[PDB]
Amino acid sequence: SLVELDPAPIAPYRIRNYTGFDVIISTKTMTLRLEDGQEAPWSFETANSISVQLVGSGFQEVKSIRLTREGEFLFGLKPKTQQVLHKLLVEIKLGKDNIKYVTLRSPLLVENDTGIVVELGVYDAHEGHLLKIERINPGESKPAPVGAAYFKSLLVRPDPGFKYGWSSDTLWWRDLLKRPTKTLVCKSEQYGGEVFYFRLHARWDQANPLTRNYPYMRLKLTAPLTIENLLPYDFKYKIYDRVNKQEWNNFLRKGGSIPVHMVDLSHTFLLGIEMQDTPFQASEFVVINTGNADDFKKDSHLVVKDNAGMPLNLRLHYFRIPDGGGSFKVTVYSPYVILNKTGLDVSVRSKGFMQSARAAAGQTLIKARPLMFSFHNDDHRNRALLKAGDSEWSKPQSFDAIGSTTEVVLQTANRNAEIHLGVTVDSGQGKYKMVKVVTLAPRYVIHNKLGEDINIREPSSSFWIPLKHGAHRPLHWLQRGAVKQLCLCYPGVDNQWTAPFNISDLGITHLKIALIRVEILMEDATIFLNLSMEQRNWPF
Amino acid sequence: PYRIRNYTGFDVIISLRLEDGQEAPWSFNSISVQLVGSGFQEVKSIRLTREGEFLFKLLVEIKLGKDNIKYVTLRSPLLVENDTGIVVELGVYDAHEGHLLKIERINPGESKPAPVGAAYFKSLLVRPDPGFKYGWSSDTLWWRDLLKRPTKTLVCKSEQEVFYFRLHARWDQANPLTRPYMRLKLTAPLTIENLLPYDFKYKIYDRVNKQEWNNFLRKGGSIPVHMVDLSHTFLLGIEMQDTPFQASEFVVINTGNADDFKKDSHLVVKDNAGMPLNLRLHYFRIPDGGGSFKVTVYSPYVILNKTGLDVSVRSKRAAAGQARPLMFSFHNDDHRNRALLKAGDSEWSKPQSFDAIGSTTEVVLQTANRNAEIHLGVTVDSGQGKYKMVKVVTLAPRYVIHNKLGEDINIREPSSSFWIPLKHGAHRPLHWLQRGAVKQLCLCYPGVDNQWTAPFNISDLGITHLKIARAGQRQRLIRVEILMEDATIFLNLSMEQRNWPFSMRNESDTEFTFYQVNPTEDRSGWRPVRYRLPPRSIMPYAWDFPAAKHKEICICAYNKERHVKLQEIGNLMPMKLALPNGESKTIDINVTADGPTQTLILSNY
């Protein structure tokens, strides 16, 4: 056999060298030589401190670097030339893997918060020469070389394959102390009009005085615009710059987000969408960013008209990227999404407070597409009306109550049956938190697990309907009464119907047929009836 | 399968000799009835297969009862129904000689006929039970007078106090035997029903026959009144015991013939502070009663405070008479009227509907000067059975936790340093919660140097397993059952007395180590917990962090790692390990499904 055990449970450092020089790290016995850009694990087999010497830098070996606390600790490189005090920054981050990541670098950091590879170049602006160039992956950061961050300037460009040149201005920390926020312009090598845009924000602690004497900054590079699609459909979008009059076309799936590097935030630019697979036309342009010269208020809504002409008022959410220096995300969403899960084709109308009732835009027939829904204005007194099949229109229902289940009883046309629906209104899960999801369901659903086919009938009614084994079916039309009931029979002729059982009484109920267990359980405004053969002892 | 009731006023012979007033069974399909000493011939060819009223004047009533037996009452076509609650004596009166012939008792609910032959010539009189000491009816009950005036008040003076019946006579207008085929129903003139959640003492006043009448009525109770006449305008006044309400003013429950007072559809009670409550009065006319009716005092809303907090309700003024159930009304009857709730030290709520029949809503209350919220569940239903006109509004906690672990436990929201104790066998509402879309909880054994568990989502309905351990002790599995009753998510914490969902079975000659993969934003609380699986061993495992979306494990051997899932059946994808002696080993990985348990088998290839 095997040894049965109880389920009880059971290189702590990783050092990277981003200094621009080869380093030698020795404990205060064990040595590790690291090239520039390489990382290696580290363990201590004085206390828990190391000593770092930058090879070929002309700097003394920094002693007594304790690696136990986390944060950014600055050490003074000892041969000061002319009151220059160059600093080595040791950054320690305790990651989620319970491993302290240790970065040896200069205090100037460049953060790539874009989705593409960015090349950072070390530039001598007096000589016109690019000393070195390092690549930064998306979501990563790289520093200027140690020592060179004080004297040399910086340039950024995208990945060469994109054929965009270096930034037309430099990234100089003494200029960034007075002007930390800057749009970085990169001209194209294939089109004079084509111009890639970065947006740079520089940030530091305003209490540390060393940033007035040394580049102790972080330089975050972002996309100036990000477009998120939280509709339940895809769209093709069209960005128009009012200045110099360019238009850029692209595609965006449901749930997706895309960065744009083709617009500058000093220009007024506009968004237009054309939703795919939906009875709506292309939208008009809405102002998603104003310029420094223009004074347009940016649009909070986006109108799409269907093929009949009725409007749908989508909403635009703006989120400023933190530490981004004015770069933002725009999100197109529908304020309501109605899910028709009744099985019957459902018409939805919108009625205002003092306004009249109008039909909803883009209503199709069922297999049921999700229906984007908005009111004509943003009143809390606005309500909606529902119609299921050949039923009468509903009472005014509220789609604003977050986390609510409501029974809706519809009287029906030319008969005395009634349709019973369950309406759930929730907020969308995760990133769809600003979208109110309205599920329309039948209130009663019966499911057959008896092993064979069955016939069901409400006992105040001569109208019977079958139900196959393993098939679920809703119970739409019901006869009027306070308590709702049902009866079962086998499909053989001259078999007898059962006693009536209340289909709204939650719990288990036994029922003899010529023992059947009916369990009755509510789930998201829908009472589910489950029929089964009782495989236990009878209660009497 | 037959039962014959001889109510003819004579003795009959059925071909069974049945005397007058005696019932007897019968089987066999027709019979013949001889009325002995009546001066009539033998009625024969009496079919007993169909139900109804058949005339031969002689009447045979056949009723197919609940015990599917053929009830066969032989009678005259003049029947007196006792639909009152007391025993009624019926007398056969000869008004030309002042002469009472026979006296027949009628129990409540049943009916008794006039004698055959004497119905067409002699009049009738009713009275109550002679233990009540009330005389006969002052007027006579003559059916020719009832053919023109079918509805009357029957008055009975006391023998040392006036008793009243309401008589209505009904018949088929298309019957050819008009001018005595009729039914004479006797009802109480008034019935008062209490559908309040408190008892009251009531008092009936009247303008004519100035006579106050005081009595008591419990909750859910109904009482007939025989001391008033429907020709009199009379008034009802209630006073509820064990309430903070005072006595009510008199409202008009019956108008007279000569008066023009409107019948009050409402009844206002006032509390000890002066705030009003508008109870409603439902009137139900008794069918074929001749205008006798039932009045019903009910509250339009009953608010049940099941939260455990002190709750105030306002109506858009404050509610009157503010756990006992709270009767609630609005100032008027508009569907745009809403209410506001306050619970404890929280702000007032959004406008809530008490008219939304069959609804469960979640109400979130921002508390005063702190960033915690109170989460409530509001359920609005109609009452059960006879309470269907009352709207019942239950205020409940949104979340309730229940300890069935056997030991005491401590609970904590994972974004909070504030922990709450929880004794064994104790229900507790989770009122105050931190803000956020995903509400979570953590458990810990009491005492320091004990670690908290992984967070689990308390809004995800179903079964969730959670691993817990004391300091230096082994792990035990907690079953967390999360179920929604009605605006109340009950969390039940028990110790799992079932095999664990996973069994790591290392059949190979290689020591492994396994851990749950980092999902990364996340709210699983993932920390590194590695387990050692020595060669030829087995150990049950439950997810270390059940709040993760994608859940896989990572097995590790000789600085090699392999992610494997734990729900699929696997694909026997082997893992190649480079051993320090220079050779290579190959570990086959399979997942079998033993019922609810998924077993991971690592073998040698």
Assess contact for A134 and A106: CB atoms under 8 A.
no
Could you tell me the maximum CA-CA distance found in chain B, to the nearest angstrom? 134
Assess contact for A224 and A264: CB atoms under 8 A.
yes
Q: How far apart are CA B544 and CA A446, in angstroms?
A: 38
Assess contact for A22 and A134: CB atoms under 8 A.
no
Helix (H, G, I), strand (E, B) or coil at B170: strand
Side-chain half-sphere CA neighbours of A288 within 13 A: 33
Domain ranges of chain A: 13-105, 108-222, 225-333, 336-442, 444-533
Q: How far apart are CA B76 and CA B124, in angstroms?
A: 13
Among B231, B353, B329, B212, residue whose Cα is nearest residue B281: B329
Q: How far apart are CA A158 and CA A114, in angstroms?
A: 10
Cα torsion B520, B521, B524, B529: sign: positive
Cα B511 from chain centre: 62
Class of domain A225-333: mainly beta
DSSP assignment of A332-351, as one string?
A: EE-SEEEEE-SSS-EEEEEE
Asked if B359 and A522 come within 8 Å (Cβ–Cβ), the reply is no
Q: Look at the block and give the residue holding tokens 């088998």.
A: B601
Chain B contact residues (CB < 8 Å to A): 356-362, 388, 437, 467, 469, 473-475, 484, 500, 505-507, 513, 518, 520, 526-532, 534, 536-542
For B528, the closest of A4, A97, A482 (CB atoms) is A97
Assess contact for B469 and B476: CB atoms under 8 A.
yes
Give B-chain residues touching A6 at CB under 8 angstroms.
474-475, 539
Among A37, A154, A150, A133, residue whose Cα is nearest residue A88: A150
Q: Look at the block and give the residue holding tokens 């995300």.
A: A329
Q: List C-alpha distances in Å: A227 to A236, A314, A329, B508.
A: 12, 14, 6, 52
Method of determination is X-ray
Phi/psi of residue B412, each to 5°? Answer: -160, 140
CA distance B351 to chain A (A): 10
Give B-chain residues touching A522 at CB under 8 angstroms.
484
Any idea how long chain B is? 605
Among A514, A460, A513, residue whose Cα is nearest residue A484: A460
Assess contact for A511 and A528: CB atoms under 8 A.
no
Residue type, A221: L
Q: How far apart are CA B396 and CA B311, in angstroms?
A: 11
Q: How far apart are CA A520 and CA A508, in angstroms?
A: 6
Q: Look at the block and give the residue holding tokens 């055959």.
A: B116
Cα torsion B319, B321, B324, B328: sign: negative
DSSP assignment of B554-597, as one string?
A: EEEETTEEEEE-SSS------EEEE-TTS-EEEEEEEEEEETTE
Residue type, B175: N
Q: List C-alpha distances in Å: A76 to A205, A376, B62, B554.
A: 19, 65, 115, 43
Give B-chain residues touching A401 at CB under 8 angstroms.
361
Among A282, A287, A290, residue whose Cα is nearest residue A300: A287
Partners of B11 in beta bridges: B36
Give A-chain residues touching B500 at CB under 8 angstroms.
7
Q: List C-alpha distances in Å: B121 to A353, B92, B93, B118.
A: 72, 10, 10, 5
CA distance A540 to chain B (A): 23
Report DSSP state, residue A210: G
Q: How far apart are CA B455 and CA A259, in angstroms?
A: 34
Angle ∠(A218,A224,A230) on CA atoms, nearest 5: 115
Helix (H, G, I), strand (E, B) or coil at A290: coil
Phi/psi of residue A380, each to 5°? Answer: -75, -15
Alpha helix ranges (H) inside A18-159: 148-151
Assess contact for A278 and A233: CB atoms under 8 A.
yes
Q: How far apart are CA A500 and CA B219, in angstroms?
A: 30
For A404, the closest of B359, B520, B529 (CB atoms) is B359
Give A-chain residues touching B356 at CB under 8 angstroms.
406
CA distance B48 to chain A (A): 27
CA distance A261 to chain B (A): 26
Helix (H, G, I), strand (E, B) or coil at A309: coil
Assess contact for A258 and A361: CB atoms under 8 A.
no
Helix (H, G, I), strand (E, B) or coil at A174: helix
Helix (H, G, I), strand (E, B) or coil at B386: helix
Which run of H or of E encompasses B74?
A: strand B70-75
CA distance A259 to chain B (A): 20
Q: How far apart are CA B228 and CA B291, in angstroms?
A: 14
For A44, residues 6+ apart whose C-beta sits below 8 A from its C-beta are A13, A27
Report DSSP state, residue A310: -
Asked if B506 and A2 come within 8 Å (Cβ–Cβ), the reply is yes
Assess contact for A519 and A507: CB atoms under 8 A.
yes
Among B53, B33, B49, residue whose Cα is nearest residue B41: B33
Asked if B539 and A4 come within 8 Å (Cβ–Cβ), the reply is yes
Among A401, A348, A342, A395, residue whose Cα is nearest residue A371: A348
Helix (H, G, I), strand (E, B) or coil at A217: strand
For A403, the closest of B361, B532, B538 (CB atoms) is B361
Assess contact for B525 and B518: CB atoms under 8 A.
no
Assess contact for A16 and A104: CB atoms under 8 A.
yes
Site from A98, A404, A425 to mutate, B interface, most B CB atoms within 10 angstroms: A404
Q: Count helices and strands (H / E) in chain B.
A: 1, 52
Q: Count helices and strands (H / E) in chain A.
A: 2, 45
Q: How far apart are CA B46 and CA B73, in angstroms?
A: 12
Q: Look at the block and give the residue holding tokens 């009223």.
A: B53
Assess contact for A275 and A233: CB atoms under 8 A.
yes
Assess contact for B235 and B219: CB atoms under 8 A.
no
Asked if A8 and B469 come within 8 Å (Cβ–Cβ), the reply is yes
- Give the burial class of A199: count Cβ atoms within 10 A of its Cβ; 0-12 exposed, 13-18 middle, 19 or more buried: buried
Q: Tell me the CATH architecture of domain B190-298.
A: Sandwich (2.60)
Structure-token pair, residue B370 = 């702190």
Asked if A2 and B360 come within 8 Å (Cβ–Cβ), the reply is no
